[PDB]
Amino acid sequence: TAAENVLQQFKTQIEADPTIKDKVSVNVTTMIITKAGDNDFVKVT
Amino acid sequence: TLTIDGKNKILATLTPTTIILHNVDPTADPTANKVTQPVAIYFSEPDNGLIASEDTVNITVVSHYSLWDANDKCVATGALSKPQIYVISVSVDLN
Amino acid sequence: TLTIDGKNKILATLTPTTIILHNVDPTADPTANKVTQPVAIYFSEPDNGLIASEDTVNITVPASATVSHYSLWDKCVATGALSKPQFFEGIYVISSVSVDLN
């Protein structure tokens, strides 16, 4: 709760998350989310 | 009298995944007395015979607890700080 | 405060294949002070959080040597002091050696 900086905040929170960082990948330039490692299912809402 | 290297070898395989709290001691029987629902918990790598939780789990509603592994086998039990939402502000030690 | 199941799962992963005797205490430095050569040892399945060697072990102590301690290898995983030191040459008999979490 305050455009690149908001996405970077989300990316850092996700990558520091205890669980999601293990099995989700994030890239920013706009943001993108995909698989990471074995995980087979991912959703964003 | 295992050395530190042996203890590091050991704790790497004992990996719990969920925690459940009880109104009565579950050490005698880990099945009954369940007050809460399974809550995921994560642990870091062993070091000096210690594995510490990565995040302070929050559990919704007891004076007791019981760790479980991925295959429904209880691996630890004990009493909590005080009887009575509960916040798990925890590690496993071989010393 | 692990339950018996946790102790049994934990102990199943210890695989000490050999033992070595030391005259100086090997806890501080388990790599030096080798008195006798490695001798194979065998361990049983865990029960009530405890394991023990399945059979006796015989070790040849060299000439004019003395034995004070021992160390397990597979890397080193444990060390301990013998029940009593002994200045022999001869054969030193080691009965069942137990590792416990109780």
* One-character DSSP codes across chain A: ---HHHHHHHHHHHHTSTTHHHH-EEEE--EEEE--TT-------
The tokens describing B18, both together, are 């969920």
* A29 contact B CB<8A: no
Q: How many CB pairs under 8 A join B and C?
A: 57
Cα of B6 to nearest chain C Cα, Å: 4
- Give contacts of B11 with chain C, Cβ < 8 Å: 10
The tokens describing C92, both together, are 């030193």
Judge contact between B61 and B85, C-beta under 8 A: yes
User: CA C15, CA C41: separation in Å to the nearest integer?
Assistant: 10
* Subunit partners of chain A (3 or more CB pairs within 8 A): B
- Give contacts of C101 with chain B, Cβ < 8 Å: 94
Nearest one of B62, B54, B70 to B14, comparing CA atoms: B70
User: CA B84, CA B67: separation in Å to the nearest integer?
Assistant: 19
Q: Which amino acid is it at B86?
A: Y
Using what technique was this structure determined? cryo-EM
Q: Contact B9/C77, CB-based, under 8 Å?
A: yes
Judge contact between C13 and B14, C-beta under 8 A: no
3-state secondary structure of B59: strand
For residue C75, what is the nearest residue in chain B, using CA coordinates?
B5
| DSSP string for residues in C12-63 | TT----EEEEESS-TTT-TTS-B-S--EE--B----SSEEEBSS-EEEEE-T
